Structure 1
Amino acid sequence: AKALIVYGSTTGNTEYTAETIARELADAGYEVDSRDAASVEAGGLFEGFDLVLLGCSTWGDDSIELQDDFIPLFDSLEETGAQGRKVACFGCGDSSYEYFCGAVDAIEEKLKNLGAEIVQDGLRIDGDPRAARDDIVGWAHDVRGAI
């Protein structure tokens, strides 16, 4: 299986998150292509991949904004090829906020309307992903046992 991981990380939390998952997938024998949203190019980005993992942090106070590097991809997700594609989402936030990880909820909803298959509900990290380390290892394990 070949997987694409694309992440949008401001203070590298979600970045750290993306690495933990990749290691997980690689150890399992997956081929893993990992890309920072900052440089990705949206059209057919998902083509030739058996699994597409998408990560993004939640920002904003009383509004939900998506991590900055991510926006442009988010805007161009219909150019992707997400139709019939096997996807899962992840991201870091803080529960103290009104829309916890609301950026996760978004990417999900969008994926869903484009026609992707949502293999697993989103990993929503509250806090330092470094302290949720095990939760991550496990979600990755659960995503794989769902393809």
Structure 2
Amino acid sequence: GMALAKIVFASMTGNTEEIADIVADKLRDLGLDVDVDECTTVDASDFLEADIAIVATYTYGDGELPDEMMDFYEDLADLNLNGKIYGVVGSGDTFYDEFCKAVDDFDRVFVSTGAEKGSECVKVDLSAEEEDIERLEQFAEELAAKV
């Protein structure tokens, strides 16, 4: 394939899963091999094997990580991912005044590992509309371009 992308997601009410899937589908159409897994089913260290690492996450309450993301975040923060390209996407809402703060938190943890951000993070309000789909597709196409 063009390269190997590993997308890890957390999703409570399905929006973030759907977003992960949109990104995965464009990457597959561009010729990459892609794995798409819920965060409870993989290890952060599996990222060592990939060329592109992506986290798709919702945000829980007052700007927290998903409960199920806490262990994955810890494991990821302890890795050295020099030479990997990353990106971060997610769904959120404004009810807790911390819209997609988990997306920002995962951007920072990736910076700390030495990986390089390949495209601007994509934050979606609740479910994806076609305008959000376009943004996600441009994100995937920019990562593909960088290889």
Q: Same fold (TM over 0.5)?
A: yes
Cα RMSD of the aligned pairs, angstroms, is 1.7
2:60 alignment partner in structure 1: 59
Using the size of structure 1 for normalisation, the TM-score is: 0.88
1:5 alignment partner in structure 2: 7
Give the partner amino acid of 1:46: F
Q: Secondary structure at the match of 2:53?
A: strand
**Identical counterparts, % of pairs:** 29
Residue 31 (str. 1) matches residue 30 (str. 2): no
Report the number of matched residues: 144
CA deviation after TM superposition for structure 1 residue 117, in Å: 0.6
In 1, Cα distance between equivalents of 2:100 and 2:146 = 23
Aligned pairs for 1:1-147 (under 5 A) are: 1-42=3-44, 44-60=45-61, 63-131=62-130, 132-147=132-147
Unmatched 5+ stretches in structure 2? none
**Cα gap change, 1:49 to 1:21, in 2 (>3 Å):** same
In 1, Cα distance between equivalents of 2:63 and 2:95 = 14
In 1, Cα distance between equivalents of 2:85 and 2:73 = 17
Unmatched 5+ stretches in structure 1? none
Q: Secondary structure at the match of 1:59?
A: coil
More strand by share: 1
Q: Secondary structure at the match of 1:53?
A: strand
Give the partner amino acid of 2:57: C
Give the partner amino acid of 1:143: L
More helix by share: 2
